[PDB]
Amino acid sequence: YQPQTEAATSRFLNVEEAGKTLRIHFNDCGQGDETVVLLHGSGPGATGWANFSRNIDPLVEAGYRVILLDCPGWGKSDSVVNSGSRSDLNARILKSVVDQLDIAKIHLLGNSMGGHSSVAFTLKWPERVGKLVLMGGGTGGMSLFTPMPTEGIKRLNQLYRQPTIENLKLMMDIFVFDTSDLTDALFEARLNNMLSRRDHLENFVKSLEANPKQFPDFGPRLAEIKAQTLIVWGRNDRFVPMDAGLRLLSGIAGSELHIFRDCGHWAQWEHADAFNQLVLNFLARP
Amino acid sequence: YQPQTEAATSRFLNVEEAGKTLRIHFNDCGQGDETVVLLHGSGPGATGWANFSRNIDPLVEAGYRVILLDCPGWGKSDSVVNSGSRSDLNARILKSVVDQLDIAKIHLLGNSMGGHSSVAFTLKWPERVGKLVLMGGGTGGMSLFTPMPTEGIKRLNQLYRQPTIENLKLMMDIFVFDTSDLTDALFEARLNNMLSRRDHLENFVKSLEANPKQFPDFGPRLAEIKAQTLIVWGRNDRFVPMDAGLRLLSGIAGSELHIFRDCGHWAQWEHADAFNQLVLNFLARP
Ligand SMILES: [Cl-]
Ligand SMILES: [Cl-]
């Protein structure tokens, strides 16, 4: 097995959204019968590839087709200004990409914003989803115990307005439990993605100005989900409180929640092996 | 491979406790470099064999020696009236058995009272334990959200006082999320273990009368634990509140918590397959 590469799996497709046509980027990996979509977080400089670099190969080696969608406003995809539901917007784009590639069912691994988007997608088109895996996100709403805006979201919002190296370091320093895990390659890739697309950073800020609540609260509709769901969270997540994971657990019947204590807001990376093993086990369930 | 039988693995050993010598029973299954000790709950009629019937074989087949200890006051072991710390009494007994069996290290799977016991043991003899797995128990203390005595505990205490088939069904009815799980076989074996040793039932009530707080609150000392720990819980556990699992999680560094939503107080049984998978993976980590 030869590890996958970004350039080799890179692809584009057009999607119709609100009367306008936008070019959307995504990485297509492997060819398996079952497909697994990975939706990135909302950090500045984030892309499907950089977010899931440590989880792509275990999925392909296992025989899954892996697609990492870069939501508009991030990566090589066109930028956009969202004044409505960010969650539903991305879900719409994924829907188009999925229909065009003629893919019937998909498993979802949503990270942070990706989690909200996966729940939105599953809520809208349940018949098009197999299993759902949520990490650090999934539903909008208030935390019962942690102050908001959270310590992390403040640094993320600040970085977006002032895309400096210092703010990138300020944000990432509390993004993961053990910063010794952050690599220079990782850091440099984000920074490069940040500075290479200032149109994204500017539109993200504008989206917040146009609509402060980018993510709907799907709480009351969680009873609708029939997909076998697995929720993953870090106990020390400083961006999205852990009790959000508890809410998702209480709302989705038959779900399970796995919490890593020594972990921040990026479990798929901080505890990659434990994570990839949980996911593969989960995805293999009947 | 032939499934393990309670009759074939049955064994006894003598342990010195409080100046007296009590006959302790336990089932010794399989062979393997590493040994996994399983500690049963505190329900009337409970035994190591009955509690872990769905976990013994996958454990043995994975290549572990499995010891199921029936703590004094339960099963074929001698009875006892405990006015001190239950968790510590049990850990002493295990310490004796493990020294007598010449076993250097042990992995632990503690169920409810068993979890409290595994933590007591790990706190006293950290050098003798490998990995720590706690299910529905581990530390005394108050719940932050659920009323105590809990709905489940009131029925467990009622059963001990008045050992009737009606009260056994009543306890079990809220012991698991899906009562369709309970088998006539499981029930009958429970009834037998209960009515068989009325001395145990009587001594449990006497112990409670002698000492209302059978389990010490290990919260302040949880930071002493260095064992890689895995905590498992049922969101709908009506005997021991799930936030107790959260406490273990926050207090034990490097630990992980896995919660089953549609699960009561007996996850090892209710979600046997997924539980065994979680444990085997866990036990296999370096
Ligand atoms: Cl991100
Ligand atoms: Cl029990």
Swiss-Prot record, chains A, B:
The keyword Cytoplasm does not apply. The gene is mhpC. It catalyses: (2Z,4E)-2-hydroxy-6-oxonona-2,4-dienedioate + H2O = (2Z)-2-hydroxypenta-2,4-dienoate + succinate + H(+); (2Z,4E,7E)-2-hydroxy-6-oxonona-2,4,7-trienedioate + H2O = (2Z)-2-hydroxypenta-2,4-dienoate + fumarate + H(+). Homodimer. It holds the Pfam family Abhydrolase_1. InterPro entries: AB_hydrolase_1, AB_hydrolase_fold, Epox_hydrolase-like, MhpC_alpha/beta_hydrolase. Changing F175D: 100-fold decrease in catalytic activity. Catalyzes the cleavage of the C5-C6 bond of 2-hydroxy-6-oxononadienedioate and 2-hydroxy-6-oxononatrienedioate, a dienol ring fission product of the bacterial meta-cleavage pathway for degradation of phenylpropionic acid. MhpC shows some selectivity for the carboxylate of the side chain. MhpC is not a serine hydrolase (catalytic triad), as Ser-112 is a non-nucleophilic catalytic residue and Asp-237 is not involved in the catalytic mechanism. GO terms for biological process: 3-(3-hydroxy)phenylpropionate catabolic process; 3-phenylpropionate catabolic process. Its EC number is 3.7.1.14. This is 2-hydroxy-6-oxononadienedioate/2-hydroxy-6-oxononatrienedioate hydrolase. It is an enzyme of class 3 (hydrolase). The active site is at H265 (proton acceptor). Pathway: Aromatic compound metabolism; 3-phenylpropanoate degradation. Changing N111H: 350-fold decrease in catalytic activity and almost 2-fold increase in affinity. Coiled coil: none annotated. The record marks R190 as: Catalytic role in ketonization of the dienol substrate (substrate destabilization). Keywords: Aromatic hydrocarbons catabolism, Hydrolase. One of its GO terms (cellular component) is cytoplasm. The keyword Metal-binding does not apply.
